[PDB]
Amino acid sequence: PPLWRPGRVLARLREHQPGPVHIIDPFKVPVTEAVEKAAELTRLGFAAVLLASTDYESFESHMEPYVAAVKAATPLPVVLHFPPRPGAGFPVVRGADALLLPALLGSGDDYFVWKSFLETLAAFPGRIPREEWPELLLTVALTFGEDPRTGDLLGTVPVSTASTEEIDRYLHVARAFGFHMVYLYSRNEHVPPEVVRHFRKGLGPDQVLFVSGNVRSGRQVTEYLDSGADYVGFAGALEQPDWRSALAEIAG
Amino acid sequence: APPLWRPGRVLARLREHQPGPVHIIDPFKVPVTEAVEKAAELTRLGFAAVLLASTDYESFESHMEPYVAAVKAATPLPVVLHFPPRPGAGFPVVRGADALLLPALLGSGDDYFVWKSFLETLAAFPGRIPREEWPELLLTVALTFGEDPRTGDLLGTVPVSTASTEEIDRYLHVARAFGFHMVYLYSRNEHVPPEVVRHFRKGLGPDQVLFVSGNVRSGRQVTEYLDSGADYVGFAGALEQPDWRSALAEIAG
Ligand SMILES: CC(C)=CCC/C(C)=C/CC/C(C)=C\CO[C@H](COP(=O)(O)O)C(=O)O
Ligand SMILES: CC(C)=CCC/C(C)=C/CC/C(C)=C\CO[C@H](COP(=O)(O)O)C(=O)O
Ligand SMILES: [Mg+2]
Which value, to the nearest 10 degrees, does the dihedral of the CA atoms of residues B92, B94, B99, B101 take? Predict the structure, then answer.
């Protein structure tokens, strides 16, 4: 089993053409609605389905059957993205194709910078046979704009864009440590397109670049893809009754 | 549960013990009876720990479990293992060791030796050894100085540039933000520059332990490195000879 080495999911993300990726928050979206949504993602040509949230409780009992219901509705890989908790590490369930593991390089708490990875692997394989574990996508995760919620929870400080000094240090780490992916996120604002370009030009060719946060239009998706993002994530735009119209606009 | 990667007793002792020399016994070259004779002397000098370390090893578990047990019966000092990892296995480990020094070779061109060795080692934990009997892990930034094709060929290391502080400062930023426990500055064929030691001491947090080793053969060298800010000054080869008692007395005095 690849585990922390590159596997099937990373290969699919590297070779698929760039595009939008819908993110289903499984603790806010009822499983029946997630299944209806998942059936549409497949038709649009998205590369994967991400299940992600800042908050979670009773993870294993909720997520194992939630992941199975989504997998029955779409052939796309199902990737989990959640923060770790001291004493447990990152949450995991069998059936997920991959876990996106964020190393929060801008956090003031070394647990969220990377020690969460050590706690997670110490606990591996735990309850799940090694042969059935999801693959791990080792990711540099950076936050942009004022965000006291993630700051309070994970210790993140917004990345300073007054110079490229801080991002240049993250680029050196992303390259030398052989991270698989970089995830640029803004909870309350927008990751700057020029930061996306700086990362695309500074990363190796096989390092996958995700951008998300407040993407609500196809124009925003296009601008980020033109700036070099491999995938543009969006969750909140579809957390409403008229999600089918919003999805068609974002994917158009 | 074992502290494992969290700070434990061995790190607390390294943090609080008086700075000084630390002898490193290569267990694949030094016979165990000589290691035991050495261990008794290191105890008298009040060194902080006994390191068992080597670039090379074979049949690790069967050789090291009895070797560590004999050294532990000879000294009350913590026994710390320091060896390179191997893809497919991670770092080598035996029960009985108090701690394993885990080197993140930040200057390597191979990401396995930069840090993925840590992921393979923890994945494999607990493995063949019960959780409660595992050694503590000392998370360490490991940096090499001077021409060294042996470590370059084995682990992908490139000598750290001392032409400016650009490279070193990036390693300090990582050492601090990632919360490494220790920094180990090593030169196989030359000497780590005392000024680099001082730059690291000034740049590290107060609880980050700084080790320097490589070609230390005299007490004057130990004093110079301790005066430059090293917490511990390692030495192996100086004692790999018949007149080791004289050499130890000169390095420790
Ligand atoms: C901070 C970090 C990057 C990782 C640590 C783990 C962590 C907190 C993972 C949860 C997923 C996440 C980064 C943000 C939540 O929502 C956005 C979509 O936003 P929108 O509703 O605005 O589209 C998403 O899932 O990407
Ligand atoms: C490259 C690195 C720092 C870590 C990777 C793992 C690794 C190769 C561990 C083995 C220990 C080591 C760094 C060097 C061997 O001898 C010196 C003492 O030298 P002297 O005989 O000149 O006194 C020592 O043990 O420190
Ligand atoms: Mg494990």
Answer: -10
Closest CA to A182 of A162, A164, A202: A202
Resolution of the structure, angstroms: 1.4
Write the CA distances from B212 to B7, B219, B250, integer angstroms: 21, 14, 18
A144 is in an annotated binding site: no
Number of domains in chain B: 1
Give the method used.
X-ray
Residue A87: DSSP 8-state? T
Name which residue sits closest to atom 25 of ligand 2, judged by CA. B53
User: Which ligand ends up closest to the CA of A126?
Assistant: 3
Tokens of B64: 């090291």
Nearest chain B Cα distance for residue A239, angstroms:
36
- Note whether A80 and A91 are within 8 A (CB): yes
Question: The tokens 């030495």 sit on which residue?
Answer: B235
| Separation CA A167–CA B88 (nearest Å) | 33
Quick check: B49 and B79 in contact, CB under 8 A? yes
Angle at A198 between CA A194 and CA A199, to 5 degrees: 120
Are the Cβ atoms of B179 and A124 closer than 8 angstroms? no
In 3D, which of A14, A222, A168 has the Cα closest to residue A98?
A14
The span from the CA of B146 to the CA of B161, in Å, is: 9
Beta-carbon separation of B178 and A114 below 8 A: yes
DSSP lists the bridge partners of residue A85 as A89
What is d(CA B19, CA B233) in angstroms, rounded to the nearest whole number?
8
Q: Are A118 and A172 in contact (CB under 8 A)?
A: no
Q: What are phi and psi of B191, to 5 degrees?
A: -125, 135
Given CB atoms, is B169 within the 8 Å cutoff of chain A? no
Is the Cα dihedral A140, B172, B9, B65 positive or negative? positive
Range of the domain at B6: 1-253
Residues with a CB atom less than 6 Å from ligand 2: B 24, 53-55, 82-84, 103, 105, 142, 144, 151, 184, 186, 213-216, 234-237
Identify the DSSP state of B196: H
Task: Supply the CATH number for residue B160's domain.
Answer: 3.20.20.390
CA distance B90 to B119: 8
Residues of chain A with C-beta less than 8 angstroms from the C-beta of B122: 118, 121-122, 124
What is the distance between the alpha carbons of residues A15 and A147, in angstroms, rounded to a whole number?
33
